Design a binder for this molecule. Sequence first.
Ligand code: PLP
Ligand code: PLP
Ligand code: SM
Ligand code: SM
Ligand code: SM
Ligand code: SM
Ligand code: SM
Ligand code: SM
Ligand code: SM
Lengths: 423, 420
Amino acid sequence: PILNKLESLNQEEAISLHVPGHKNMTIGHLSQLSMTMDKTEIPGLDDLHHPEEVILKSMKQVEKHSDYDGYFLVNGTTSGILSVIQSFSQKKGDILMARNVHKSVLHALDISQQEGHFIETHQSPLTNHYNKVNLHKLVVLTYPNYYGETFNVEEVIKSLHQLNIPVLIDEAHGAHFGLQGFPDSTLNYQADYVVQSFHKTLPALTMGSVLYIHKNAPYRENIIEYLSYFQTSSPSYLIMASLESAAQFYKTYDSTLFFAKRAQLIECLENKGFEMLQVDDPLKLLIKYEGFTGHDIQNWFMNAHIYLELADDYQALAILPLWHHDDTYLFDSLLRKIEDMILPKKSVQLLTTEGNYKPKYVTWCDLKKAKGKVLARHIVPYPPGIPIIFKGETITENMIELVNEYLETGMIVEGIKNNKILV
Amino acid sequence: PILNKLESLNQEEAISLHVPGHKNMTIGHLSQLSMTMDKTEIPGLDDLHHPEEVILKSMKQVEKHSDYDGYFLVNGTTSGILSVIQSFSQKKGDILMARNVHKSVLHALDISQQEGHFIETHQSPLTNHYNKVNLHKLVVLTYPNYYGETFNVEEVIKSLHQLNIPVLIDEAHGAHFGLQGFPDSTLNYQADYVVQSFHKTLPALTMGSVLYIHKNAPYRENIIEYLSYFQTSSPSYLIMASLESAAQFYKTYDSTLFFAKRAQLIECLENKGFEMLQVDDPLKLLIKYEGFTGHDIQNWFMNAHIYLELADDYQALAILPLWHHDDTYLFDSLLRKIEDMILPKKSTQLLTTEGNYKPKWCDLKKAKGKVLARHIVPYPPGIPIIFKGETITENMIELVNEYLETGMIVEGIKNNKILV
Ligand SMILES: *Cc1c(COP(=O)(O)O)cnc(C)c1O
Ligand SMILES: *Cc1c(COP(=O)(O)O)cnc(C)c1O
Ligand SMILES: [Sm+3]
Ligand SMILES: [Sm+3]
Ligand SMILES: [Sm+3]
Ligand SMILES: [Sm+3]
Ligand SMILES: [Sm+3]
Ligand SMILES: [Sm+3]
Ligand SMILES: [Sm+3]
């Protein structure tokens, strides 16, 4: 079944504007890999969880900044994130968190049983999504957010260090950061831990990621040991080789061709009546169309066998390829598919406050009576279909008000049934 | 450098007798895959963490037994082991363990902070490794051991269920079990959880495994949820595709040719003067040569560009290919290489006792009552006899001192001290 669908997508010549960043083997040099290289810890090849030969030499090549050591991840940024946070489990204090931390961070606090606390987290006026925080054993921040928006993370990092708190930057969507024309990575701002999902925006295979640890960061050794707990003992050499290939691609990339093709794409879309929101990251294209939803726009592109990354009620997200001179991306077919598209005629508040998290039988309780209690299931308003209140939080006056405001306006709200909340 | 090595292995026609089970893409049908198919949760493809379409349908085809639901694992059997154990964390009692449990089991107790206890575990007179247990919220057993040795596991599972204890069976080396002429899987013995590393002995890609959860098993929905915690949010469709392929390979496999080719290889090996230990699983071949070590053997084989799985002092282990009529394996070259090899002329009592585990340098003589902080690993055979988190006893000290008395290399020991 899976193979049958994958073959069918191949025959329809599907065009990727989605993860991973090799774009159905059109961007990058992964054509140099082959499955015959899917091997194991035989002498001559090294051992990821004990690297002292060809993998360590490769690790020295994945380096982007001289204050950091890099480590290969085969179980995604997820595994980096589990390994950094687990190392704090026996230390006093709690873990501070933006409201747009990835679920992996909440999974880490749950399985390790650690106290948490959400930082005041604010909404973009552009994207309607979380995009910045305002200020105790660790801080976790997402940078960029999913939609490629940045904020003054450097200053936050400095501020937290003056209080002696280390920071973990979830840089899942900033693996391409540092290339000419793009935003800067947090590797430049003395972040203690920075995990990047190579596979999401670079030509690495799905699941490939890298954890960068600052050479002075707390619990370095423990963290390195947990990477060998949270990743299989049988790590993939295909994935590892793709990290290596993708790192070489990052090292020698020239972006001039990208910025030209990007301009052409926007031209083409705009002449079709689409409206794009320019975020800080040029790789992330947000497409709107007056009178219609992102899901509608997602569907329209799919009907042309072009596959976007995701959508919300407001807009759809294209993650652009890292186009280069020798790529096999179907650029002309992309632009030609957009031109001939037949579109219709055109027509037509997140929780920001701080909060405690506890890593904790359940029951539905009336909102009015749920105050002071621990939430047992996420509240997810549509739009934007991401959580405003996570399970583990203590329910407040303010939360109930905003949640009733949602319901009064007829906004779909998951984690609520019959005007009750799970506790 | 990683690629350069991988390429030079291909340029020297490396012959695999190691994991994974596609054997340098000579065994199986993974030539139907392409890295063009390395995609994501776009519409049409499903979602491994919330499967209700193509991946759910594929799970149904992964079924080996109607009493179980199979779940794809892209982070190995490891992720499966972590998911099962985590679910018992808030429940009272300890996790009972064979002394040859894999490191992920101890990792799991450590991350989840659960009490453990080791079961009496015996040493094989054949392999001199741990091969069998002798009899409380959960029991974790390894079946088969990685040398392909089995034991009366059915009988142990029945005794435990009568004491109302569920069992997790680490079947990492039993993915090919149930095939004609091979031992049977614990899926037949009502085991509550069975984890199989498809990639190790079937033609699936490295990292691809399957967790089978009995439909009555304790904490089913919690375990299924934790699968989405311990695995990446971006699971590889290549790996999933490879498990789907490996399943179809299992179900359609005819092993008549395997046993013919196995016998011809043993014939060839015997004629060179190698001594082969016959273990319960036909897929595992244990090679000896009188006067020399398993390491020596592995070297001699590497010099012929034949790669064995691993070795200890006693023996070198070969994991055989699941040969078939349309495979592309270099069988003649293997025999040729063995034939014309130029070989020289011919020329550890493990701790079996039960013991408690706590998820938490001292003279060995003064160590009784302290909790071990680093594994004690005798060479040979180079696997732990006493694990970090165990309480040191008079008998452990006696045993370990006799190790040292006799010139046996012991890791975890420095200046006759142990780490506490
Ligand atoms: C995808 C993602 C992750 C997780 O990385 P994987 O490589 O999918 O494990 C973490 N944080 C954010 C913001 C992500 O988008
Ligand atoms: C390899 C192995 C594992 C782990 O499985 P992976 O697929 O490598 O994660 C667990 N138990 C035993 C006995 C093993 O040999
Ligand atoms: Sm607190
Ligand atoms: Sm404020
Ligand atoms: Sm207008
Ligand atoms: Sm000859
Ligand atoms: Sm005594
Ligand atoms: Sm005694
Ligand atoms: Sm003596």
